[PDB]
């Protein structure tokens, strides 16, 4: 009735997405074999949202895995929940993109996406009433950002009156795991501004710092970072699958957060992350979660909200709580803290509560916020791109595959247009 | 013989409607299967199948299946008709131009055909009971073209619209002031009488009188459900003087624009408190006109009263009512307009209020429900036009409403009518 | 008759709430045992590496 | 046939299998009260003189 | 002393007869074996052999053997006559001239020999009941030359015909616009009353009322089987006001070229919904006139009714029939022609409907079958001549007809008749 199609592209997209299907199958009760070994009649009530049917009481995900290197999905297929997908939906090439954006958009990805959309077409036409799409990528590479922004514009023309969900990992200032990282971020965000209804920003730097000051982790491997991202992905779209007192689907969150069509980049968060030093001494109340929501350490990007202003803030709760206690707590954050919110919008704060919390936790919630602090993430990319563009460093193979010099200047002008509109509305 | 039709659109009406039909069955002695256990009091709200099942006169309509499909599998799945539970596919999602122009246009023939089938089983019709809220686009966009068709098809039938009002500090949506001004357009012309209740004043009443520290959404609908049961208690039961739905339509509304009464219940008390207090008619009448018990967050002492209607239930003797009425006009704080000395209307009924299972209200012999029409809404509407004008100076959230089919000129057309409605209070509030 | 109906509805709601409570309750000890096994695995891995 | 019965017993859990079998409607015994034979009872209002 | 003869040709006519002669066995208590356990109510349809077997009065003719050969192997082997099951070798193969010109000549002497033999056993003939479909080559080709031998043999006998109308959008053959025109060249001359049923309207009857999402051809033929047993029921049972077969020719055929009525049955409902409803005489007669229950896909609000014949069954009384009929005449939506101030014809029987075991229809006390002669069929015949004209401008599919005996000139002669027949709906639709 309200179906979502999930697409995983790139190494960063596939590793996060493969953990995402392990999280939600535990909440719905699906074994790694694919059969339903579930415990409640409420888990199977709304299961067509993310899953398609099989033969013999089995459920397959509504996912398409695409990447230009076959070696990445060999690790995914050999994983814990790798035996759940359809082998027809695996679409791979043989020559890698080389982390070069002009390869993944013009000369290498342009021959694969004929076979990519045919999987998307027959998986989206089979629905009865489609709501939107999900796509996971990163804004640092040539595979996540080369094919990632190409897949959006092909299906935006095919399905115009729908909603796009892209969960994008943004490049960090200090981590810097790629030499050409400031180039392909500006080239990819030129298409995400015009063609995506909802884009999320995730920082590896912030995801590291959450694991130390809050979870007190000793060895934060790449398994634990995807456990933080996948819990926020499930909390956004919990009103489709679970009953609630005050519910809000995906298009419900499309209207309230986006006042003008240019500003749809959200900083997200999770409410009850707790270390086991203070897990067993913790108190669980609605005022206690609210302290942990608006912490800037809990946000998953390197932007300080006190260096800007908030536009719209929502928090999707999960569990059995009292709705008066929810709203007076979320009114007090606006009355007393008046500077950090804008002045020409009354009641910046939206709320939503569902009755099904995540497993093993009494009360939980997810945080989503729209702030003018995100200009610094875009400003630091624009100044790194400006320094290298003067000397034309690293640029002479992008020009070697049919991509002109004027295309990079067009992206920088459109990038500085986004920074101006955040400061103008501040 | 005499009966009414109940329509529950949006979400906020449905859980109120779920709490109302759980209240109606206990008063008439019907199990939630719908059959009496092993009298024409139920003909106002139920239809008797010849086999022995009572079917409610209710249609439950929403644009999304996640709220109605809990009723098809709930306790009351055996009570309703399976074709009365109308259900769409994709929700309007708080967009007036969705629930009125592009999504509400695919199920209007199904909801109106159920209205014809329910009203053809009728023998004599009194009115309708539509439940909605102002904030949501489902409770605003869909109601507007619902009552546009009922007004044309049914000429002089009453349409008692029950509406939730957006509180000044308690609110959920951010586009909520945009929908409520657009919601007002269907109530100024197609609505005979629309009742106003908000959420924030119920929060304090549960926090002050009930001593509930953490009120929720199931406790608010029980307080609202008593008032809807109190209005229609003069139809299902015999009393000293009985009020029809058409009876108090004339009594409360002065003008073709001012039809927004304010609901109040008394005594709103807990079980640990009423066991010690002596309650009579002379106290529960004064508790209605107290400034701390109005169920809409507004100050009545700023404005002036226009018309009132107090409905008493239970063991009430009508001489004791007259002493209570005469006491009020002697007090100087309660102020009425000089062009209306006859401002009260009384109703006494012999059927006491009932308790609900798992509820928080007390067993009290008599209770009074007050419907007050005052000028205190003037500050409550000068507020909501400032929220609309603040976000419309920079054209915020407009590009969603425009794309679905709604024009831009109707945002200014709705604001100029709210200016005409705001100045109608001050035009009639001054004493000649 | 009102007392009888109130009693039966109270019993029905109590049974449904009990079902929801027990199904929500049986989650946490599984996670506790999972992390106890994780701690034992970490200690054994450290000793094996040494 | 017994193995197909195994397969259909496993396959009966589906939403499509609950909503729409071949040539029939869904199961009406949740809707109707327990213990009532449907084809034997009479639905409607009897006219008595 | 009252009898009817049924002929089933093609596949669509015969396969309904599998569900038609199934139903007559339950009503009178005849086993499928053909022996009656422990009364002249079955003399219209069954003739009793002196040994005790009861045999039907039906002739089963098909050029293709594969649909009759399953009857000769089934449970109903012991019911029919071995000589009333006539089969050929090769079908008409969706060709008109293979049923009328080439193959239909060789076996029609055996067909009319049986109809001569059945009539000598009968003491009174009231009509014929020929079942076929328009689209096929056997349902269109073979019935056209059957009636023109039939009309020269029996002159004044009624010839009631139940034909499957080709649906507007859904169809299972390609030359159906070619093959449905050729039937009407003779049925406008040699046929007196041809009822219309299509497949797309019953699909949405099953989808909405019965809540059947996956229908087959055994589902549809049980619904069509009820209407024929409701039309005939005034001949087999005693009633308050009975209608003869010749009786509703004069009521329904005002002009010699306007004899195409639409059948409608009510209450067509499932077994879960009817337990909640109060099915009465004043409501099941409104279920016929709503546009969602006509068994032909046409919009009746565009046209106007000419003659209606409401045939009731079960516990119905004459007051509630005509109190509810006069309710319809006050409604503005149902528009009659001004040259028929009276158009309603009423028949009432005393027997309730009978459901088959394993069926999906509910067991209801009463039923109504409506036969409406309307002018809305012009829009149904406008779209089918538009199907013929686009396929004839390029001479598609013509060369299969000329290779069997059919000329090309009769394609122009049959088309010009539909130019006149659609014109006559306007010459009678204009008001004086
Ligand atoms: N009393 C009461 N009010 C409610 C309840 N649920 C929601 N509301 C109020 O309804 C307002 C919003 O309108 P809703 O009815 O929830 O939304 P809607 O009309 O269904 O529109 P959509 O959500 O887009 O479908 C909120 O501000 C709440 O205050 C409830 O269960 N009880
Ligand atoms: N309702 C219903 N319609 C049928 C059935 N069988 C065939 N039809 C209709 O008949 C049309 C085709 O014409 P037929 O009567 O089947 O063809 P025919 O007369 O048997 O001609 P031949 O097949 O050559 O012998 C199709 O478009 C169907 O709509 C049936 O069992 N039930
Ligand atoms: N959270 C998370 N991030 C990862 C993981 N693997 C790689 N990354 C990030 O992805 C960035 C590089 O992206 P890249 O591999 O070039 O994207 P690709 O071209 O699509 O393969 C690095 O900065 C890493 O921080 C992972 O398993 N988890
Ligand atoms: Mg809703
Ligand atoms: Mg055939």
PDB file of N, CA and C in Angstrom, chain B residues 359-389:
ATOM      1  N   UNK B 359     -11.222   3.919  33.526  1.00  0.00           N
ATOM      2  CA  UNK B 359     -11.195   5.361  33.459  1.00  0.00           C
ATOM      3  C   UNK B 359     -10.661   5.997  34.724  1.00  0.00           C
ATOM      4  N   UNK B 360     -10.538   7.322  34.670  1.00  0.00           N
ATOM      5  CA  UNK B 360     -10.057   8.103  35.798  1.00  0.00           C
ATOM      6  C   UNK B 360     -11.123   8.996  36.414  1.00  0.00           C
ATOM      7  N   UNK B 361     -12.292   9.109  35.792  1.00  0.00           N
ATOM      8  CA  UNK B 361     -13.366   9.915  36.345  1.00  0.00           C
ATOM      9  C   UNK B 361     -14.043   9.180  37.498  1.00  0.00           C
ATOM     10  N   UNK B 362     -14.788   9.935  38.296  1.00  0.00           N
ATOM     11  CA  UNK B 362     -15.426   9.413  39.493  1.00  0.00           C
ATOM     12  C   UNK B 362     -16.898   9.113  39.237  1.00  0.00           C
ATOM     13  N   UNK B 363     -17.507   8.409  40.190  1.00  0.00           N
ATOM     14  CA  UNK B 363     -18.943   8.145  40.171  1.00  0.00           C
ATOM     15  C   UNK B 363     -19.623   9.261  40.952  1.00  0.00           C
ATOM     16  N   UNK B 364     -20.220  10.203  40.229  1.00  0.00           N
ATOM     17  CA  UNK B 364     -20.827  11.392  40.810  1.00  0.00           C
ATOM     18  C   UNK B 364     -22.283  11.430  40.369  1.00  0.00           C
ATOM     19  N   UNK B 365     -23.183  11.725  41.317  1.00  0.00           N
ATOM     20  CA  UNK B 365     -24.617  11.560  41.090  1.00  0.00           C
ATOM     21  C   UNK B 365     -25.135  12.471  39.985  1.00  0.00           C
ATOM     22  N   UNK B 366     -24.640  13.703  39.915  1.00  0.00           N
ATOM     23  CA  UNK B 366     -25.127  14.653  38.928  1.00  0.00           C
ATOM     24  C   UNK B 366     -23.958  15.406  38.312  1.00  0.00           C
ATOM     25  N   UNK B 367     -24.096  15.744  37.034  1.00  0.00           N
ATOM     26  CA  UNK B 367     -23.055  16.486  36.345  1.00  0.00           C
ATOM     27  C   UNK B 367     -23.690  17.389  35.302  1.00  0.00           C
ATOM     28  N   UNK B 368     -23.072  18.547  35.097  1.00  0.00           N
ATOM     29  CA  UNK B 368     -23.599  19.581  34.219  1.00  0.00           C
ATOM     30  C   UNK B 368     -22.584  19.877  33.121  1.00  0.00           C
ATOM     31  N   UNK B 369     -23.071  19.972  31.889  1.00  0.00           N
ATOM     32  CA  UNK B 369     -22.256  20.355  30.746  1.00  0.00           C
ATOM     33  C   UNK B 369     -22.716  21.718  30.256  1.00  0.00           C
ATOM     34  N   UNK B 370     -21.781  22.654  30.142  1.00  0.00           N
ATOM     35  CA  UNK B 370     -22.082  24.025  29.758  1.00  0.00           C
ATOM     36  C   UNK B 370     -21.580  24.288  28.348  1.00  0.00           C
ATOM     37  N   UNK B 371     -22.424  24.904  27.526  1.00  0.00           N
ATOM     38  CA  UNK B 371     -22.024  25.406  26.218  1.00  0.00           C
ATOM     39  C   UNK B 371     -22.122  26.924  26.271  1.00  0.00           C
ATOM     40  N   UNK B 372     -20.982  27.598  26.192  1.00  0.00           N
ATOM     41  CA  UNK B 372     -20.918  29.047  26.315  1.00  0.00           C
ATOM     42  C   UNK B 372     -20.458  29.662  25.003  1.00  0.00           C
ATOM     43  N   UNK B 373     -21.143  30.720  24.581  1.00  0.00           N
ATOM     44  CA  UNK B 373     -20.772  31.504  23.409  1.00  0.00           C
ATOM     45  C   UNK B 373     -20.380  32.897  23.885  1.00  0.00           C
ATOM     46  N   UNK B 374     -19.111  33.260  23.695  1.00  0.00           N
ATOM     47  CA  UNK B 374     -18.572  34.491  24.256  1.00  0.00           C
ATOM     48  C   UNK B 374     -17.725  35.208  23.216  1.00  0.00           C
ATOM     49  N   UNK B 375     -17.185  36.359  23.616  1.00  0.00           N
ATOM     50  CA  UNK B 375     -16.265  37.135  22.798  1.00  0.00           C
ATOM     51  C   UNK B 375     -14.808  36.888  23.167  1.00  0.00           C
ATOM     52  N   UNK B 376     -14.534  35.879  23.994  1.00  0.00           N
ATOM     53  CA  UNK B 376     -13.159  35.526  24.323  1.00  0.00           C
ATOM     54  C   UNK B 376     -12.423  34.881  23.156  1.00  0.00           C
ATOM     55  N   UNK B 377     -13.137  34.481  22.100  1.00  0.00           N
ATOM     56  CA  UNK B 377     -12.503  33.915  20.920  1.00  0.00           C
ATOM     57  C   UNK B 377     -11.799  35.012  20.116  1.00  0.00           C
ATOM     58  N   UNK B 378     -12.112  36.286  20.390  1.00  0.00           N
ATOM     59  CA  UNK B 378     -11.533  37.397  19.633  1.00  0.00           C
ATOM     60  C   UNK B 378     -10.018  37.457  19.776  1.00  0.00           C
ATOM     61  N   UNK B 379      -9.507  37.281  20.994  1.00  0.00           N
ATOM     62  CA  UNK B 379      -8.062  37.194  21.164  1.00  0.00           C
ATOM     63  C   UNK B 379      -7.526  35.854  20.686  1.00  0.00           C
ATOM     64  N   UNK B 380      -8.373  34.823  20.671  1.00  0.00           N
ATOM     65  CA  UNK B 380      -7.960  33.524  20.160  1.00  0.00           C
ATOM     66  C   UNK B 380      -7.893  33.493  18.638  1.00  0.00           C
ATOM     67  N   UNK B 381      -8.501  34.464  17.956  1.00  0.00           N
ATOM     68  CA  UNK B 381      -8.407  34.567  16.505  1.00  0.00           C
ATOM     69  C   UNK B 381      -7.506  35.698  16.033  1.00  0.00           C
ATOM     70  N   UNK B 382      -7.292  36.727  16.857  1.00  0.00           N
ATOM     71  CA  UNK B 382      -6.252  37.699  16.542  1.00  0.00           C
ATOM     72  C   UNK B 382      -4.869  37.087  16.700  1.00  0.00           C
ATOM     73  N   UNK B 383      -4.760  36.046  17.526  1.00  0.00           N
ATOM     74  CA  UNK B 383      -3.528  35.274  17.641  1.00  0.00           C
ATOM     75  C   UNK B 383      -3.216  34.506  16.365  1.00  0.00           C
ATOM     76  N   UNK B 384      -4.186  33.742  15.860  1.00  0.00           N
ATOM     77  CA  UNK B 384      -3.918  32.804  14.779  1.00  0.00           C
ATOM     78  C   UNK B 384      -3.745  33.485  13.433  1.00  0.00           C
ATOM     79  N   UNK B 385      -4.182  34.736  13.300  1.00  0.00           N
ATOM     80  CA  UNK B 385      -3.907  35.472  12.073  1.00  0.00           C
ATOM     81  C   UNK B 385      -2.505  36.065  12.085  1.00  0.00           C
ATOM     82  N   UNK B 386      -1.919  36.246  13.270  1.00  0.00           N
ATOM     83  CA  UNK B 386      -0.542  36.719  13.344  1.00  0.00           C
ATOM     84  C   UNK B 386       0.441  35.607  13.000  1.00  0.00           C
ATOM     85  N   UNK B 387       0.126  34.365  13.383  1.00  0.00           N
ATOM     86  CA  UNK B 387       0.955  33.229  12.990  1.00  0.00           C
ATOM     87  C   UNK B 387       0.904  33.007  11.486  1.00  0.00           C
ATOM     88  N   UNK B 388      -0.261  33.227  10.878  1.00  0.00           N
ATOM     89  CA  UNK B 388      -0.393  33.066   9.435  1.00  0.00           C
ATOM     90  C   UNK B 388       0.339  34.170   8.684  1.00  0.00           C
ATOM     91  N   UNK B 389       0.269  35.407   9.181  1.00  0.00           N
ATOM     92  CA  UNK B 389       0.891  36.520   8.469  1.00  0.00           C
ATOM     93  C   UNK B 389       2.406  36.520   8.617  1.00  0.00           C
TER      94      UNK B 389
END
